[PDB]
């Protein structure tokens, strides 16, 4: 996918201390969870370095995602550092890309 590749490249760009101090809800990374990933990341407020990632994610989610609002993200227990979240998201997206899915 052209959108997928571009998002991979952006995540590589920004991870090679992203939003230092910012914690987000952990996700149970499995296929198609673009909505959940955005539902978590949309809640980061003072970090311009992830703004593009946020816009890019909206392209992959068929519904509007607004901060404070949840639907696709059903579990909110563990909170993790943004850097870790985005690194884990990256490996997940690379797998999708490798799979052709």
């Amino acid at each position, epitope marked *: 996918s*052209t959108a997928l*590749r571009e998002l*991979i490249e952006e995540l590589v760009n920004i991870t090679q201390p992203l939003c230092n101090g910012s914690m987000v809800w952990s996700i149970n990374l499995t296929a198609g969870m673009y909505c959940a990933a955005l539902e978590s990341l949309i809640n980061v407020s003072g970090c311009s370095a992830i703004e593009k990632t946020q816009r890019m994610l909206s392209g992959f989610c068929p519904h509007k995602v607004s901060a404070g609002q949840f639907s696709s993200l059903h579990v909110r227990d563990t909170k993790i550092e943004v850097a870790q979240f985005v690194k884990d998201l990256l490996l997940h997206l*690379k*797998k999708l*890309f*490798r*799979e*052709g899915r």
Partner: antibody
Amino acid sequence: QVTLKESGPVLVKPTETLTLTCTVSGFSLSTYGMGVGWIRQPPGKALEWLAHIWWDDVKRYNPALKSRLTISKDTSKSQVVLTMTNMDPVDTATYYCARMGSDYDVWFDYWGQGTLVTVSS
Amino acid sequence: EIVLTQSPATLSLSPGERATLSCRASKSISKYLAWYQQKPGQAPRLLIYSGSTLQSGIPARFSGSGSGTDFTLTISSLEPEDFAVYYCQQHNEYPYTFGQGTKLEIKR
């Protein structure tokens, strides 16, 4: 040093099955980002990608040949195996295995020396 | 399926001269083109990936450039060891495809 070596040259009769093994060194087939592909080249002709497999068993096959191809790997043996059914004289070629030079994209940085497979009666 | 057309089929140049090899794709492949060099009886050798990234161990006379549908491999000043067959391969999309090669031969 990363090395790859294809199993010995083989003769296959038309309709028969080709099995090739690639033995690898200088990397592990369970290490993040490691992948191996097969690429063939008929005598005097261009390279053609066949299939590849990643460290986590994710696989891709050339769609024109998908029904004929299987790829597998075994980390303990450091081996990648390609199986190709219903061989035809047109499949006579040098078969290479090669490592992907990326953790998710498809181009090849280290190559085996190639093995000649001849399909003929 | 992305078709890659390499020009010219055979390029005849003398050592010392600048070479330009062309590779054109049937549709856009963004920047994702790899170049390989191949000598008789030998496996292909990776020279360039993602359009313009020079592989380690490849001398700096080599450069890839281009994007979209038009790509070039150039060599600033040919050395004897550079005469060989050159293949392009796109890695924008599945199925991964290669061009038919340019044979760079010594003009004498």
